[PDB]
Assembly symmetry: D2
Homo-oligomer: 260 residues x 4
């Protein structure tokens, strides 16, 4: 597509969907061209920006074919089943797709791989630019600080969060353990292999703080990500939409960010 | 005693003792008049400041009677048994005593109480001015934030530390639980009683960081103490020496700080 | 009023108003009974919770008399002029009022004082429970740490914030300077009066972080408030509504929190 | 040299020298073989570890030729003039040299370059492993976060520190500005070039904290170094000694750490 890129948002009335509308609004190379919901949504017919203070001119719709016909890229952070119906239609209409939906098993992932032969896809477990950058720099840090350091993955989340450690924290752990030549799960001297541990805070409504702490005698290095809202994932999803414009293939956020 | 106050340091060659020598040096109302070690110390006869860059003129000595005869106050962060021998001599010589030694049981504590009838004593589990202030303000904070908050006591210590949570963290917990009308050890709504938990980091050579985190929807309050070295305990011990000058009785750091 | 307390929200379509709707929803002793906007609002006739996922049954209205007639308390974080029209009607209808509106000069403040003879008012520069608690504990901290400490007020705010230091930071400064017996604006030894300074970070979309750092040789004490969203002010405004129920008079957040 | 590597320490009685003695003691591949001071030092004839609790068997000496004759590497964090006398003798005796001394101008740097033709040298402005790693990762971070972020270099130091921002902070700035294609010294949208600023805290006896904060809408990334003591520089200097064993040439800490 020509600039500006015409973006459609699935699940436009959900929490991710609203922030995505704002993310499309903030990026100067994109415009909102569609906003999808299922046929039961209380929000059908409302302006896509009604809950975030924007007049987009785009009525929230359940007409998937009509929306895709006038869009260049669909951004989808919904559930696996509806995402894969949207996928088939993107393929048919030659629309790119940014899949932030998680929870696919082997057969869902195969479906995504197959469609990537025919359209541009960015499929990532996490769309935060900062998080993905953290995963990348942690490999380097852990290689250099491979002896003599105690390594702790510290995370803070909202009270009712079920998974401890979070998926992000576990990934940070896997990157570090990998860089140390190890598999995940006294005094550490200068030639002792650096050690890994996890600490978890569950409190209030914390969106998510993740710190990798590398500590030795006389120093601490801390690599920290702090999420203030879902805008971090939304902004990275829109960056990915812009990046994958004009491409066919299966990409991830490492590709988007020019890493590895 | 007249100013300047003449301070003697027990265990002058240990880690606390050296920092105490520096603490006496830094405070303008005090001077070093004695520095005690046991008869086996490699440091007998050396200047008390030999390891901290100071020329005090005070030879490290094992002559307890001679040192006490020319001092106004003894500061002692050693072990219970030698501390209680020093106690008897302070009583005899009318010297005040700042007891930072920990690990007394009921009979040691009774001995301290008895001697406080005859000399000035400050006996505290912790001599850090900041820590004791933290214990005091936590009562207030927890009373006001008694509903609706998730409370977490987070601490960082050096790798080989045995006790988790630390004694300081446990005290912070007891103060908070007490303020909530409770005994120590889902979503918290605005009228739900505030909850307490502990998180522990063991890494590197961290002297000790303690945070009490109070979290609710939309906000965090954090009350934090960071120890950079043993100087925090030493400086509070010297403040206590100055405070207890001219007094007889058993006092603690709440007294020294004018709290409660 | 009987429980549940019937709350009306002014400026219901603004940023504070939406969060207030959520705050009334979360508190079990309150219910939403009115939601006011001016006659030009695009949101007249919409459900008060339309932008925050709640079905309140309350249509956003411009009928001030009708709304006040069926409410016990109005919460108002709007502008001085419209707030003072609402004030007159609260007086007439015997409705309490929580004034979070700022920017009153001497004549506005006199108007609020006068109406407090006839209805219950809580009027505070800041409705965050944590912030007001911070202002209170800082007095104590600064009294105890009155000699020997370097004191720094550190704040982080969103990029385009105009005022540096923020009003909160300046208040923290005034409380501290006051506790030190001073007026606002080398090595600090143990008997030197503690010193005050300010540091400011302007970056991203940070809602607001405020830290008072007290530092000396060997230790740091940090008293920190972190705002994650406007819910902190909204939740404190609803606490104040509940507190002032059954009272006549002019109160502030120190009263609400049982402080001083 | 064979393992264990025989290390000599210049300025053995200074602050860096003492920590270096401890660093040599902690590393299992090194042993202390000499400890140098000038002819006026009060510490001549004392054991090199007298102030740090170690019995090294090495008398602090002013006999530079004798010490170098029995050592493989000299570690020197002293002053330019005495360092360059030591340099000439290392060249003569075929001893490697780790130069942590700073403040050389063009002619001193030329002298170091010349001697590197004849012996192994590691010459770095900063020997902290964590700091040098930070400088390296900041290039990557700033390249990826090149648009849309506000970047702040925040540092904390002891009260009487003269230089603001510190040399480390200025270097962090130069690395970032360089990565952004710029020279050092409103709302930042997603395609706006990321901006740089500095904030400085002067307080207490803080050894040195440095944070690079990258902030945008919805997220913060923080890359932080915290120095607890001079051991961080000392430990990196000993790592460099071990690394440069068996080499001739001029190297820096990027080389030691296997970076670039």
């Amino acid at each position: 597509g020509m600039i500006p890129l015409k973006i459609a948002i699935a699940g436009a009335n959900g929490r991710m969907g609203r922030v995505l509308v704002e993310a499309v609004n903030n990026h100067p190379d994109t415009v909102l061209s569609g906003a999808l919901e299922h046929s039961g949504s209380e929000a059908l017919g409302l302006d896509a920006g009604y809950a975030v203070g924007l007049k987009t001119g785009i009525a929230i719709s359940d007409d998937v074919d009509a929306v895709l016909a006038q869009s260049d890229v669909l951004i989808d952070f919904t559930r696996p089943e509806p995402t894969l119906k949207h996928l088939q239609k993107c393929v048919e209409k030659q629309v790119n797709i940014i899949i932030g939906t998680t929870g696919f098993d082997d057969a869902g992932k195969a479906a995504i791989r197959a469609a990537a032969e025919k359209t541009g896809i960015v499929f990532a477990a996490n769309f935060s630019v900062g998080v993905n950058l953290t995963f990348h720099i942690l490999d380097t840090v852990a290689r250099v600080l491979n002896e003599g350091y105690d390594i702790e993955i510290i995370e803070g989340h909202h009270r009712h969060k079920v998974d401890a450690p979070s998926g992000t924290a576990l990934r940070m752990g896997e990157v570090i353990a990998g860089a140390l030549g190890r598999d995940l799960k006294g005094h550490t001297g200068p030639r002792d292999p650096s050690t890994i541990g996890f600490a978890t805070v569950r409190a209030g409504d914390i969106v998510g703080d993740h710190t990798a702490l590398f500590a030795t005698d006389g120093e601490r290095v801390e690599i920290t990500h702090k999420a203030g809202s879902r805008m971090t994932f939304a902004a990275g999803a829109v960056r990915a939409a812009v990046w994958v414009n004009g491409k066919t293939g299966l990409y991830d956020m490492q590709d988007v960010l020019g890493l590895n």
